[PDB]
Amino acid sequence: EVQLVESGGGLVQGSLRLSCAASGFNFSSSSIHWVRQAPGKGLEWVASISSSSGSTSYADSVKGRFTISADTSKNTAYLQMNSLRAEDTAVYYCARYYIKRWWLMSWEDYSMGLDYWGQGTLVTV
Amino acid sequence: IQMTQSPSSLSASVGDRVTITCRASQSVSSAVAWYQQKPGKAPKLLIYSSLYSGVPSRFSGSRSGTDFTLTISSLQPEDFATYYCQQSSSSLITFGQGTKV
Amino acid sequence: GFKMFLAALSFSYIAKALGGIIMKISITQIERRFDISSSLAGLIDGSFEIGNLLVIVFVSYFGLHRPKLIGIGCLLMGTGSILTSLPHFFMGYYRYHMWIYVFMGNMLRGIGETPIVPLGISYIDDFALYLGSLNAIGMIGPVIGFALGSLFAKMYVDIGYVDLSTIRITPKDSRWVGAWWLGFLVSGLFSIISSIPFFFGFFQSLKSILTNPLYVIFLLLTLLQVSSFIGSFTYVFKYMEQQYGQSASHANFLLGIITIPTVATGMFLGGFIIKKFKLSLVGIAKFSFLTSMISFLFQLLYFPLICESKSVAGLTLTYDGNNSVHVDVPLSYCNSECNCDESQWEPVCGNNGITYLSPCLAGCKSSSGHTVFYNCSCVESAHLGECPRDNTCTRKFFIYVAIQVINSLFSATGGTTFILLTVKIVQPELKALAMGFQSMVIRTLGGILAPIYFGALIDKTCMKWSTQGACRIYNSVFFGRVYLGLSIALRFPALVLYIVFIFAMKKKFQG
Ligand SMILES: CC(C)CCC[C@@H](C)[C@H]1CC[C@H]2[C@@H]3CC=C4C[C@@H](O)CC[C@]4(C)[C@H]3CC[C@]12C
Ligand SMILES: CC(C)CCC[C@@H](C)[C@H]1CC[C@H]2[C@@H]3CC=C4C[C@@H](O)CC[C@]4(C)[C@H]3CC[C@]12C
Ligand SMILES: CC(C)CCC[C@@H](C)[C@H]1CC[C@H]2[C@@H]3CC=C4C[C@@H](O)CC[C@]4(C)[C@H]3CC[C@]12C
Ligand SMILES: *[C@@H]1O[C@H](CO)[C@@H](O)[C@H](O)[C@H]1NC(C)=O
């Protein structure tokens, strides 16, 4: 019952806060990654964060104006844009790594490819 | 760290062998992934050199050390979409270029 | 001024450490004086953590005036340290439920120690590294405590009230009691003088802490390891005395000289290894796992270092010393005619190397007064001092001391990483609650329980009781087996959990 719902896509002249609400899995032993897909272009990784801790990873194109957070209690993850120039007008996906569920022990494995994605929000600049 | 797919556009018939190959330029590791993205949908994990559950037994992945290749035994009409190879290291996520049709 | 507060807080750390050491080194003397079992002594030891728990939740929600409340805490420390000394003046002369006062004094000392740690760092960071220096100065306290305990355990319990020329027993005897009260009184006055210069939502975060499988696994692991450490250090003095025939003062001094320099260098080496080789979080976990493995192997090395049960006629042998055996032991013909209360703790061994329970039970009929007996029928001349330990036990004791030094060093290096390997796995904005919950779990479930259920098994290993009062002879083989097997059974699941933790932590995504 793993779900990943993204919301927050709207036209911007710039800043925008987008969310990736999760369900169906233990949020603590998981990570959230944002993927950018320009219209007609290929997938591009934006930012990543671990949910067990404050560990985050970022991309070269978006470092000084992109922030990513996660609220364990809310079971969701958030992404921030600032100074939205005319190059971040893509669709934003949110994805998680694979998670093993032996007994009640839950642990992720980054060696496994993303097994659950999101629908996506269209950000317009 | 960086992966690129040369084939990209690849046209074939129903009975045909499809081969998509991409190479890891920097920081080579076995953590490679294969995603199928239908137009206007989210990508789908297939190979990742093990078959994901629910994927038909016609997709296969292999590597000699740098040549990551995805093979389809028969190109059915249901898999005429774009394909991406993905390197998932620690603290780094990278994507290929895109191989369609 | 900040310098005056820094000096006062350093004195408070010294007093806290000194009080802790004084309480730790006096336990066996308390057991002997109050004729209580080791389970009750462990309960008294855990009453400190009970008192700390009764008040930590309050301070964790209120801040008022931090210096004033710290001063009140140190005053309560001194008051608890003196309350525990009071039964010396409120009791009669020692003869070779008063422990309730010791229990309440330890509780009061814990209540007083609770404010110093959180409020101190709150005031330090509010007006302005410092914590490490404060711990370094507080490391002076163990030194003073161990020296004072070693000095006071060789002075008689009733010093100043007896001529001391009439005391028959010696520190090597199993009925000797030192001047533990003085140690407690000195710690109390030191705490009082340290006090003087001073008066001049949530449950959702709780759920998240638990919903984190790595945090829960590490909490169970640290709980097991800290419980083993507490149960070993609580009875290390008593185990050494009852296993290798050492006096209380000698045991205190030797354990102090083992612990102080080792702890002082480990606190630095463990934190320097990480910063020098730039260990990642998984590297820190592997470091702590390797230290735990080495410590576990050294704990395994203690098992061959178990001296055999002393040859005692009546407990481990027949009353004549002819056959081996410990309850309802029958009387031999040479001993049946000279009937005795069968309950006379008068350690007097024979030249046969066999210790006998009492001169009546040994069959002795004449006494020299240095006391020598004659015509002991079942001894085939005696000597009032019970036969001491054998050279082989002495070499085992030397090996035990060396392995103890190495184990103590490894323990410090492993411990420093633990805390660093429990917050980095939690959100930065939630690290305070993680540290607090880990502290409550470890302090409660180790400090309050591990002494009690270690002492229960230790009593289970006892072979001769006084009055039941204080244990007289411990089954050395059984004592060692229980005292080491409990630690082994507490450490092995911790190791299995570490590998599980390493297995799970690695596959994780790290930024
Ligand atoms: C010596 C023994 C008792 C040590 C503990 C061993 C067993 C009981 C421990 C080891 C790992 C533990 C698990 C670790 C993490 C979780 C996830 C949490 O959401 C529910 C509890 C659960 C599922 C724990 C249950 C108890 C557990 C299985
Ligand atoms: C004789 C040689 C091996 C030096 C030994 C030094 C002593 C102090 C030991 C004790 C614990 C050891 C560390 C334990 C664990 C790790 C993590 C991993 O990164 C391997 C090296 C490293 C960092 C070890 C380095 C050496 C070490 C610091
Ligand atoms: C022993 C009895 C009273 C039950 C105790 C339950 C535990 C969960 C209680 C007792 C003490 C409490 C802690 C006291 C101190 C802190 C530090 C603070 O920065 C966050 C809350 C936290 C972490 C509290 C969390 C809840 C707590 C840990
Ligand atoms: C030991 O026994 C008797 C007393 O029973 C004592 O007078 C004597 O000197 C000793 N010698 C022997 C063997 O009788």
Numbering used by the authors:
A (entry chain H): 4 to 16, 19 to 130
B (entry chain L): 3 to 50, 53 to 105
C (entry chain A): 26 to 88, 91 to 123, 169 to 200, 207 to 278, 324 to 448, 451 to 494, 498 to 508, 518 to 604, ...
Can you list sentences taken from the study reporting this PDB entry?
The organic anion transporting polypeptides OATP1B1 and OATP1B3 are membrane proteins that mediate uptake of drugs into the liver for subsequent conjugation and biliary excretion, a key step in drug elimination from the human body. Polymorphic variants of these transporters can cause reduced drug clearance and adverse drug effects such as statin-induced rhabdomyolysis, and co-administration of OATP substrates can lead to damaging drug-drug interaction. Here we present cryo-EM structures of human OATP1B1 and OATP1B3 bound to synthetic Fab fragments and in functionally distinct states.
The cryo-EM analysis of OATP1B3 bound to Fab19 yielded an EM density map at 3.0 Å resolution. OATP1B3 also adopted an inward-open conformation, with Fab19 bound to the intracellular side of the C-bundle. The EM map of OATP1B3 revealed a well-resolved density feature located in the N-bundle of the transporter and at the level of the extracellular membrane boundary. We found that TM7 and TM8 of OATP1B3 are shifted by ~3.3 Å relative to the position of the corresponding helices in OATP1B1. State II, represented by our bicarbonate-bound OATP1B3 structure, features a narrowed substrate-binding pocket, a consequence of TM7 and TM8 adopting a more closed conformation.
